[PDB]
């Protein structure tokens, strides 16, 4: 399978992340793409191509225009305001608050944010565009007839909701990919999130749409970021009633239980009738991940990939989470091995 | 008027505050109380008494029990979880999110917070309780028959809602004081928030309550913290309809315009029929204060006190915000002179 990768991902190189009450070096650093890229090539996937140029037409069908306009100029405005650090929101539109949109940069960054551990830095916008481009190109390959494809996205995107950034995400790459397949002719597409954290951004985007089925396996929100979405009771709303399936699991969950949730999600995706599956791939489900509590081993990823590929429909794999140890590359490559 | 002040306020001495993308020393520091106290004493108000001991009965009538339980054990759980810094929420229940309450410290701190620039640290719980106590004793003096009283509260409270802390606030002292007056006999009470920022927390607590009228003058939320509340359109909900009046104002607002809003809020308060008025006093409206965009001068705080005191009803002044500028005490003292007459 071809691999879509952009070097502009390095344009996103934030110097701080709010974690544990301190501003430490970002968990989502440029070396993640470097390590993963090296491992896939090592696993035989050496056909890496850069993404072509794309407009905002696709993304404008899954993200709010106000939100996108905000991201494009967020940094400039923050710096213009005289702030010394990176752009970080501290005030949020939570319970029982007005739906009105602030005008100043301080108010808008909070309005458009769901997580304060994510800082907007110089070049974040450009990086997010390149990453989105990689997802769009991967979709085109699938739309062209290829059975599999890997969009090495960075920054990740499953936490980017309709009009909010957070969890290191700015533009929901998988959502853009699924939307791309639809504009290319598909009628039904499914997004499967295997990343450890719930794909709240993705769920929000398609929660009221019946044309995209969203399935996510993840750490119980009761005790895992993003914390405020991902419960099994969330199955869809209105036009999207019934097209959302969350599978929250506790601490220490091994492939034994995980594998079962995967099977079920695939059963519901088939029943949905997906013409293709966009896989939000996160390897932070690894037993050695620094910020997750699942216990999957490197071999499990080969099993995971094979199972998903057995669906019989084309697959577009999109990079999401996975941090710390260098095995993230191994684990990502193992998934592509299974799929191939 | 008598001044209620607790030394335990210093127990609230957070080391960090998220501002402009950095962690810096909190703007709501202990020296604020120190300079305010000294200024009011120099102005004659030197009858300072420490607050008495109080339970949680009053506060439990305005704050969610879960939220209060969270505050009490917040720091211990955060430390136990192994975080090196102070407790600061990073994830928040914003638009289109589940109403379920997380079970771990990481999720709950976010669930109970409305502003990440506030950090919970050793002593916050204790400090917040002593500050609440000062508010309670202040209200008790009013219920006794005193014309006015000053509760030198710290930490402040008007940004703490029913079940959320933020804006340097944990327990809404003004709200507690108002509840206390109702418990001592009053049927109707009003809270007037003159602090530069909107008192989103106080509004939240009494938004569906008809026994307490909430008026507030503040910088337009469209361009000022807390950013998501304080619009003129918010007049109340359900049982609390019509008992909430917001007076947002733009950049460079002179006392000339500010006083007009003060006069209208007092007119609405009088029409409501308040038996007493709790004044959430913030002096960050001062032209020399760095965080605000209003242009009030020191003399205007004397006018402010006079006007509110002219209402004819007893007044409990509760200390809120105000950047730590050298004139912070002078301005608070001027408001008290105005009330004194
Ligand atoms: K997931
Ligand atoms: K105010
Ligand atoms: K000012
Ligand atoms: Na859906
Ligand atoms: Na009210
Ligand atoms: Zn993840
Ligand atoms: Zn203030």
Curated annotation (Swiss-Prot), chain A:
Matches recorded under InterPro entries: HDAC_PDAC, His_deacetylse, His_deacetylse_dom, His_deacetylse_dom_sf, Ureohydrolase_dom_sf
EC category name: hydrolase
CDD domains according to UniProt: HDAC_classII_APAH (cd10001)
Gene: aphA
Gene Ontology BP annotations: epigenetic regulation of gene expression
Required co-factors: Zn(2+)
Regulation: Zinc ions inhibit enzyme activity in a dose-dependent manner. Inhibited by KCl at concentrations above 10 mM. Inhibited by o-oxyquinoline in vitro, suggesting that it is a metalloprotein. Inhibited by various substrate N(8)-acetylspermidine analogs bearing different metal-binding groups such as trifluoromethylketone, thiol, or hydroxamate, and by hydroxamate analogs of short-chain acetyldiamines.
SUPFAM superfamilies for the chain: Arginase/deacetylase
Outcome recorded upon mutating residue 323 to F: Reduces enzyme activity by 99%
Oligomer status and interactors: Homodimer.
Taxonomic source organism: Mycoplana ramosa
Keyword line: Hydrolase, Metal-binding, Zinc
Site features described as Polarizes the scissile carbonyl of the substrate, chain residue numbers: 323
Binding site for Zn(2+): 195, 197, 284
Positions contributing to substrate binding: 19, 106, 117, 323
Activity at various pH: Optimum pH is 9 with acetylputrescine, N(1)-acetylspermidine, and N(8)-acetylspermidine as substrates, and is 8 with acetylcadaverine as substrate.
Chain's role: Involved in polyamine metabolism. Catalyzes the deacetylation of various acetylated polyamines such as N-acetylputrescine, N-acetylcadaverine, N(1)-acetylspermine, N(1)-acetylspermidine and N(8)-acetylspermidine. In vitro, is also able to deacetylate L-Lys(epsilon-acetyl)coumarin, but has very low activity towards the larger tetrapeptide N-acetyl-L-Arg-L-His-L-Lys(epsilon-acetyl)-L-Lys(epsilon-acetyl)coumarin.
Name of this protein: Acetylpolyamine amidohydrolase
Cofactor note: Binds 1 zinc ion per subunit.
Family membership noted in the UniProt record: Belongs to the histone deacetylase family.
Active site: 159 (proton donor/acceptor)
Pathway, per record: Amine and polyamine metabolism
Gene Ontology molecular functions: acetylputrescine deacetylase activity; acetylspermidine deacetylase activity; histone deacetylase activity; metal ion binding
């Amino acid at each position: 399978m071809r691999v879509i990768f952009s070097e502009d991902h390095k344009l996103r190189n934030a110097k701080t992340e709010l974690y544990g009450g301190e501003l430490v070096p970002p968990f989502e650093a440029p070396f993640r793409a470097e390590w993963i890229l090296a491992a896939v090539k090592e696993a035989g996937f050496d056909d890496v191509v850069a993404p072509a140029r794309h407009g905002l037409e696709t993304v404008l069908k899954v993200h709010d225009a106000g939100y996108l306009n905000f991201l494009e100029t967020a940094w400039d405005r923050w710096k213009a305001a005289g702030y010394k650090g990176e752009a970080i929101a501290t005030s949020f539109p939570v319970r029982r608050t007005s739906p009105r949109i602030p005008t100043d940069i301080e108010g808008q960054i909070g309005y458009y944010c769901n997580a304060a551990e994510t800082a907007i830095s110089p070049g974040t916008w450009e990086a997010a565009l390149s990453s989105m481009a990689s997802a769009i190109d991967g979709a085109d390959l699938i739309a062209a007839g290829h059975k599999a494809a890997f969009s090495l996205c960075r920054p990740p995107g499953h936490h980017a909701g309709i009009d909010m950034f957070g969890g290191y995400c700015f533009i929901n790459n998988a959502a853009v990919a699924a939307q791309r397949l639809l504009d290319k002719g598909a009628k039904k597409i499914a997004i499967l999130d295997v990343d450890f954290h719930h794909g709240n951004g993705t769920q929000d985007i398609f929660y009221e749409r019946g044309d995209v089925f969203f399935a996510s396996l993840h750490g119980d929100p009761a005790e895992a970021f993003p914390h405020f979405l991902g419960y099994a009771e969330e199955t869809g709303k209105g036009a999207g009633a019934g097209t959302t399936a969350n599978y929250p699991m506790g601490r220490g969950t091994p492939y034994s239980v995980w594998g079962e949730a995967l099977t079920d999600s695939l059963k519901r995706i088939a029943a949905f009738g997906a013409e293709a599956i966009v896989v939000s791939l996160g390897v932070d489900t690894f037993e050695q991940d620094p910020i997750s509590f699942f216990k999957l081993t490197s071999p499990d990823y080969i099993t995971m990939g094979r199972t998903i590929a057995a669906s019989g429909v084309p697959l577009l794999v999109v990079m999401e989470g996975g941090y710390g140890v260098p095995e993230i590359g191994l684990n990502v490559a193992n998934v592509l091995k299974g799929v191939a």
